[PDB]
Design a protein around this ligand. Structure first.
Ligand SMILES: [Cl-]
Ligand SMILES: [Cl-]
Ligand SMILES: [Zn+2]
Ligand SMILES: [Zn+2]
Lengths: 30, 21, 30, 21, 30, 30, 21, 21, 30, 21, 30, 21
């Protein structure tokens, strides 16, 4: 595919895309 | 973490899969 | 605040707004 | 769960908040 | 909840979320 | 431009694009 | 109104423009 | 206004409710 | 990656994420 | 086509990738 | 309408809006 | 191109139509 900068919403939407039904965690504190 | 990997830096769709459950 | 009807990526967007820097976990059935 | 309830019915921001870290 | 920077689209989507059926005004000139 | 089928937050996104710095009011029924 | 017409039927950007400030 | 309050600065979901109708 | 159910603007968002700097073409029927 | 298949059925990121430039 | 800065996703969503059924190409290399 | 016209610079909805098929 590619590499881009993915931040906030944009970043979340990507995780939603990539993970979908598996689910995912967004943990910006780390 | 994710923010540093994918926002501050640059990440592939494959790296993003590291954060799936 | 009002009640919400959210499907798909629109649920992840809401979680994003609601949780902020705390982040969140997205965990669908199956 | 929450994912299904917000879509098939309705949900509140307060119920959403339970999924924050 | 939290506080974040909400700008443009992101800002509008938030208002949509928070206000929903009441409706809202987005008036950036002020 | 073409005609549009817009529900939910996708209506607010369209208003956002269309109105720009003028802003807009979002006023649903009930 | 506009909110319901764009969803249940179709609407134009020109009709949208009427809701600008 | 909203832009200064919520974009230039930082705002809560409660401040955002100041712009509802 | 998982399979996707994407309508409307959510298809263009996916294309955007998937293609990156390569860009893409969006070509619906009719 | 792809536009209709992702909506009416399901589609993969790998099939999406075919529409990149 | 107006003129604004439209970048990435935001830019794509706009093209989707403006072009819809005609379809469109997003070709950032140029 | 589009990025320079609409992101780096500023563009109308009419300029955007230059990229439709
Ligand atoms: Cl942004
Ligand atoms: Cl939708
Ligand atoms: Zn949607
Ligand atoms: Zn954005």
């Amino acid at each position: 595919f590619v590499n881009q900068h993915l931040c906030g919403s944009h970043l979340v939407e990507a995780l939603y895309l990539v993970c979908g039904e598996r689910g995912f965690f967004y943990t910006p504190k780390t | 973490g994710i923010v540093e990997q994918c926002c501050t830096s640059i990440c592939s769709l494959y790296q993003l899969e590291n954060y799936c459950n």
